[PDB]
Each structure stands twice: as C-alpha cells, then as structure tokens.
Amino acid sequence: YFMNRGRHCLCVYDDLSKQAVAYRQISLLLRRPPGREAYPGDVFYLHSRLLERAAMLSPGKGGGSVTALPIVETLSNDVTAYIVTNVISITDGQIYLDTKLFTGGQRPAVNIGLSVSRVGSSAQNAAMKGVAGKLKGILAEYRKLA
Amino acid sequence: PVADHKGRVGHVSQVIGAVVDVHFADGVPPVLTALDVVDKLGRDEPLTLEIVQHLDAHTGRCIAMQTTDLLKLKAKVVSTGGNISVPVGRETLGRIFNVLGDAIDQRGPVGEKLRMPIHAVAPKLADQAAEDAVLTTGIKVIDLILPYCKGGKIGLFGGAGVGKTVIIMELINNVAKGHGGFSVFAGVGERTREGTDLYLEMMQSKVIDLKGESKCVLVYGQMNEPPGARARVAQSALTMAEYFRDVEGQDVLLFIDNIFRFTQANSEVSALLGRIPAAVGYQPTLAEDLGQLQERITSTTKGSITSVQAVYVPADDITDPAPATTFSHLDATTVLDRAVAESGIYPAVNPLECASRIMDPDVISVDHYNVAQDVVQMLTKYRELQDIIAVLGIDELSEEDKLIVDRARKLVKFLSQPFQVAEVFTGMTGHYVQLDDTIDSFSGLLMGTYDQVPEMAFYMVGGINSVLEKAKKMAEEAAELEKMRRARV
Numbered sequence: 001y002f003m004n005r006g007r008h009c010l011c012v013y014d015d016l017s018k019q020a021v022a023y024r025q026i027s028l029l030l031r032r033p034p035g036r037e038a039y040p041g042d043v044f045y046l047h048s049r050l051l052e053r054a055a056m057l058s059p060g061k062g063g064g065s066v067t068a069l070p071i072v073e074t075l076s077n078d079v080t081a082y083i084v085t086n087v088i089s090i091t092d093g094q095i096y097l098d099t100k101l102f103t104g105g106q107r108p109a110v111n112i113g114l115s116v117s118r119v120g121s122s123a124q125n126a127a128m129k130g131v132a133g134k135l136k137g138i139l140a141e142y143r144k145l146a
Numbered sequence: 147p148v149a150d151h152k153g154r155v156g157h158v159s160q161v162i163g164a165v166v167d168v169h170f171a172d173g174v175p176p177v178l179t180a181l182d183v184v185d186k187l188g189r190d191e192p193l194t195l196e197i198v199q200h201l202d203a204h205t206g207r208c209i210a211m212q213t214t215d216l217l218k219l220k221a222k223v224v225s226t227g228g229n230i231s232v233p234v235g236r237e238t239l240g241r242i243f244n245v246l247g248d249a250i251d252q253r254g255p256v257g258e259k260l261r262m263p264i265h266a267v268a269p270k271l272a273d274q275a276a277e278d279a280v281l282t283t284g285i286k287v288i289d290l291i292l293p294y295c296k297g298g299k300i301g302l303f304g305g306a307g308v309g310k311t312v313i314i315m316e317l318i319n320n321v322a323k324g325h326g327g328f329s330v331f332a333g334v335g336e337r338t339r340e341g342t343d344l345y346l347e348m349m350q351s352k353v354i355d356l357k358g359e360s361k362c363v364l365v366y367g368q369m370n371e372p373p374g375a376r377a378r379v380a381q382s383a384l385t386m387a388e389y390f391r392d393v394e395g396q397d398v399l400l401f402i403d404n405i406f407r408f409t410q411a412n413s414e415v416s417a418l419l420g421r422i423p424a425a426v427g428y429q430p431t432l433a434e435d436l437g438q439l440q441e442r443i444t445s446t447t448k449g450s451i452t453s454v455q456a457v458y459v460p461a462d463d464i465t466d467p468a469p470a471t472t473f474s475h476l477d478a479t480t481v482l483d484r485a486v487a488e489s490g491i492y493p494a495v496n497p498l499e500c501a502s503r504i505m506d507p508d509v510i511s512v513d514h515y516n517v518a519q520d521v522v523q524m525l526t527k528y529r530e531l532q533d534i535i536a537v538l539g540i541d542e543l544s545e546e547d548k549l550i551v552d553r554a555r556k557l558v559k560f561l562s563q564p565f566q567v568a569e570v571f572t573g574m575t576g577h578y579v580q581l582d583d584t585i586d587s588f589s590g591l592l593m594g595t596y597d598q599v600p601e602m603a604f605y606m607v608g609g610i611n612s613v614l615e616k617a618k619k620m621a622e623e624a625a626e627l628e629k630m631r632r633a634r635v
C-alpha cells in the first residue's frame with residue numbers, strides 16, 4: 001500500500017522456514033504429490049513470487065519501495081538444505097549468523113566471509129562509501145594475514 | 147445444556163488397526179466426539195472411540211483408546227454427547243488417572259465437582275504474561291549456562307539412557323517437594339515401573355498424603371498403552387494443569403515424560419488414517435499438533451505453569467523432525483550428549499548446544515551473565531583447539547593455548563555434579579549448589595586463582611569448597627605416597 005503511493009516500507013518474515021512446512025502440510029493433506037523432503041513440487045515458486053513483490057519502483061510510478069528481510073533457519077550450519085537453497089537463490093544477499101561466532105562472544109555473529117550484498121556500495125550513503133571501501137580492503141588483508 | 151447428538155446410534159463400518167470408521171444414519175457427530183461401543187463382543191474392558199475425521203455426511207473416522215480386539219463390523223456404537231472429559235479440582239490431588247480420567251489407583255471414588263474436555267483453545271495474546279524470574283534448581287550447569295525461568299517452558303533433549311529421567315527426578319526432588327503450588331506428572335509412553343517408583347517416592351515424602359492433603363496428580367499412559375491413549379494422556383494432564391492455573395490462580399509444575407512419544411503416537415495413528423507421510427515418515431501435521439499442544443502450556447495473567455518436558459532423540463539424530471520442531475516451543479533447552487556421558491561426566495549437558503531465554507542482564511544479575519558468557523567463550527575456544535589436539539597433540543600448541551586448554555578441562559570437570567537421586571550409580575552423596583556459590587566458584591576459576599589445584603579435584607563435586615576439600619585429600623594421599631617412596635631408599 002505504501003509502495004504504490006511514493007513511500008518506503010520494510011517487510012520482515014519470521015520465518016519462511018515454517019511457512020514452507022505449513023504449505024507442505026496443506027499440499028500433502030489435499031493429495032498433492034510429494035517432492036524433495038516431502039515438500040510440494042512448486043515450493044520454490046511460493047517464495048519466488050513472495051519475494052519478487054519487494055522492489056524499488058521507478059520515478060514514474062512514485063518511487064516507493066518494499067524492503068524484504070526474510071529469515072531462514074538451518075540445522076548445524078547446513079546451508080545445503082532444500083528451502084534454504086531456494087531462498088538463497090532468490091534474495092539479493094544474505095546475512096549469515098554463525099553459531100560458533102555467537103558462542104565465541106561475537107554479537108551480532110555476522111559471518112562476513114559467508115555474507116554478501118549483491119547491491120554493493122550503491123546502497124550506501126556518500127559518507128559511508130569511502131569508509132566502507134577502505135574498511136573492506138583492510139579486513140580482507142587482516143583475514144588473509146591472520 | 148445437553149448436546150443435540152447424545153445417544154446417536156452408529157454402526158462400525160471398517161476396522162484397521164487402531165482406526166475404526168463408524169456410520170451414523172442421522173449424521174456423524176462433531177469431530178473430537180467420544181463414542182462408546184455397546185456390543186459386548188466378549189471383551190474384557192470397555193471400548194471408546196474419538197472422532198478425528200469426517201469421511202462423508204454420515205461416516206466418521208475414529209481412533210480407539212483401548213485395544214480393538216474382538217471388534218466386528220456392524221457393532222453398535224453410541225455417542226456420549228461430547229468430547230472426552232476428565233475430572234478437575236482438588237479432588238484429583240493424590241490420585242492416579244489414565245487417558246479417560248478413570249482412577250487406576252484402586253482407591254475410593256474421585257467424586258469430582260465437575261469435568262472438563264481434554265481439547266480446549268489455547269490462551270490468546272491478551273492473556274499472555276510478562277513476568278521473568280529465575281528458578282534455582284541446584285545444578286551448576288543449568289543454574290549457570292541455561293538458567294530456568296519460573297512459569298517458562300523447559301526441555302531436555304537426549305538419546306536413550308543418557309540421563310533425561312535422572313535429571314527430571316532431581317528437578318522434582320529439588321523443586322516440587324519444596325513447592326508452594328501444585329504439581330502434575332504426565333507419563334507419556336514411558337516405563338510403567340517408573341510410574342510406580344515415582345508414586346512410592348511421593349508417598350514416602352508425604353507429597354501425596356492419602357490420609358491428608360496431597361499436592362500432586364499423576365496421569366499415566368505408558369508404553370503398553372495403544373497409540374490412541376498415548377496421543378491424549380498429555381491433553382488430559384494439561385487440562386488438569388490448565389484448571390489449576392485458571393480456575394484457582396495457582397502456580398503449577400507440569401512434568402511431561404516423554405513428549406516425543408506423543409508425536410510418535412500421532413504418527414502411528416496418521417499412518418493408518420491414510421495420510422501421505424512427511425519426511426522421515428512422520429505425519430504431515432507434525433508441527434500443527436505440537437503447536438496446539440504446547441501453546442496451551444503457558445503462563446497467563448491468571449496463573450503460572452512451569453513445564454519441564456523430556457524430548458527423546460531417536461538414534462541420537464538431533465535433526466529428526468520431532469525433536470527439531472520442539473526447539474521453537476521452549477524457553478530453556480538442555481541438550482544431552484551420549485559421548486559426554488561415556489566420558490564419566492554427569493549430567494551429560496552439552497553447554498554449547500544449550501540456550502536460555504533469561505540469559506539477559508535485564509533478568510539475571512550482571513555478574514551471572516558475565517560469568518556465563520566467559521565460560522561459554524572458554525568452552526568454544528577449547529572445542530576449537532580440540533580439533534588440532536586430537537590430530538597432532540597437546541605439545542603442538544602455543545604457550546597460552548595450553549593455559550586455555552587446562553582451564554577448559556577444569557571447567558568441563560567442574561560442570562559435573564553428583565545428584566542426590568543417582569547416589570546408587572555414583573556411589574557418592576549428592577550435592578545441592580546454591581546459585582551464588584556457583585557464580586562465585588566459576589568466576590574465581592576463570593580468573594585463574596585455582597591453577598594450582600589438580601584437575602581431578604573438580605570432578606564430581608559441589609561448590610568450590612568441595613573442590614578445595616577434595617584437593618586437600620588428594621594432596622594428603624600424594625604426600626603419603628611420596629613419604630613411602632622416600633622411606634624406601
């Protein structure tokens with residue numbers, strides 16, 4: 001509603017892992033052929049059409065936007081699961097929270113190595129651009145040398 | 147009021163395992179309705195069915211609470227006019243019930259004021275409570291790393307014979323006996339001998355004073371019971387707990403052992419209902435059943451329910467759908483590991499895989515939080531170092547890495563504790579460590595003031611004072627041995 005009227009919104013889904021379970025339950029009860037891990041065949045398309053609705057409208061349509069922050073749970077840091085892979089292949093990035101870092105005292109446990117933002121510096125303010133650009137190189141060198 | 151379908155006559159149309167289909171000429175009663183089989187059938191006990199599905203406008207699929215032996219087609223069935231209801235009130239205190247609410251202790255009639263259906267709607271958002279406290283259990287690992295919250299939901303995850311039952315008994319002894327409010331022990335798919343042992347223990351400790359006022363209720367559907375009763379004993383026990391919480395505003399303790407058997411029974415019945423299995427082979431409604439059951443186990447604005455649930459992990463596979471789905475429904479999670487138990491460390495809690503909700507400086511004291519975080523960091527670093535140690539050796543570490551390894555080994559030994567209920571297995575008097583003592587001892591150990599104390603002094607002891615006493619005894623023995631060796635010259 002706010003996107004189509006020149007305003008910006010943030011949508012948080014906590015969490016898509018359980019929506020997939022609910023959809024699988026509904027499909028199985030209604031006699032749908034099970035797929036991988038008993039999930040329905042069109043389980044990717046569900047999240048794919050859910051997350052494609054978050055966009056940045058052009059100036060001709062108002063300029064509003066919706067930002068999506070879907071949340072997904074893994075088991076023993078296994079990102080090879082079915083729905084986890086599907087969601088990773090849909091979003092424009094990922095903030096991977098590592099269990100080992102969380103217990104090691106690092107909070108938020110953002111694993112910079114496994115995290116990525118495909119938008120890049122385009123989504124940064126002019127003030128933050130230079131600081132982040134130099135910081136990325138410094139951290140990369142520190143991790144390599146460490 | 148009286149139900150409009152009470153006394154409705156139906157006939158058994160199909161029998162497969164514990165699932166029976168009943169045909170009603172005037173229309174199938176509402177789902178969850180309780181039906182009774184009227185035909186004698188030469189059975190030794192009555193037969194009761196619960197409607198779980200509607201096949202059509204006249205046929206309904208039901209699950210039997212007793213064995214369906216000697217059950218023929220066309221057998222007459224009569225509706226009871228409502229769901230399965232169980233006794234509630236103070237009249238149930240000190241008694242032993244089954245899934246149907248019948249007293250199985252062979253004592254006088256219950257004479258309850260009223261009964262309530264086992265199936266009920268969970269509390270709404272407006273009824274939720276916002277109270278956070280700390281429940282002192284007397285166990286160093288739990289009180290330190292994963293403190294329990296009063297009125298919260300607790301879970302113990304573990305394999306077969308890891309120590310789930312022992313921890314539950316220790317918690318019962320250390321809390322329920324000295325508990326102001328009431329308690330409910332729900333046995334779901336566990337050994338029947340354990341129920342007898344618990345009943346004897348309660349009677350001996352006067353927790354259940356048959357000649358006076360009792361403060362506990364026992365509801366037991368055990369392994370021998372068919373899958374129908376093992377999927378509803380939990381509902382009945384939780385209904386009694388809900389009555390105590392709401393109708394009296396009383397604090398209640400709900401010990402469920404084991405909650406995994408509930409999901410297992412649901413899966414077994416679902417396989418017969420003709421449903422497509424989910425992954426592994428569980429019913430597609432695994433998450434929904436746990437959600438409906440757990441959401442009822444909560445503390446509202448009227449009363450509080452502190453629930454301790456034992457979760458069985460089949461084949462030690464913690465990723466199994468049943469235990470995996472239970473994590474999201476718990477305030478405190480206690481994960482037990484078989485390898486830890488095999489090393490002589492009891493309890494076998496794996497602190498790195500455990501978590502608590504009240505691990506917050508706004509709830510627990512600042513010193514408690516800092517000490518717990520430091521212990522977790524030390525254990526995490528030691529686990530990382532163990533990968534190198536197990537390949538090359540301890541001597542291939544840095545100078546400070548050796549210090550971390552020694553401190554972490556002492557921490558691992560120190561986390562062990564002899565329980566007052568495991569004296570037979572441990573052969574040692576149990577300990578009850580105060581919360582403050584645990585924090586002080588662990589804070590001192592982290593600082594390094596106990597580097598001189600031997601590593602084994604921390605094994606199977608209580609507070610720091612016990613550690614020092616054991617170290618003194620070990621030093622005396624070592625001095626005696628050294629004196630004997632020297633005199634041999």
Ligand SMILES: Nc1ncnc2c1ncn2[C@@H]1O[C@H](COP(=O)(O)OP(=O)(O)OP(=O)(O)O)[C@@H](O)[C@H]1O
Nearest residue numbers: 305306307308309310311312492493565568571572
């Ligand atoms: N705290 C403890 N101290 C000493 N021994 C323990 C302790 N906990 C468990 N054990 C040992 O492990 C055995 C099995 O414990 P327990 O009865 O708690 O099993 P469990 O976790 O309930 O498993 P299951 O019910 O599936 O058999 C005990 O008989 C005892 O020998």
Ligand SMILES: [Mg+2]
Nearest residue numbers: 310311312336
């Ligand atoms: Mg047990």
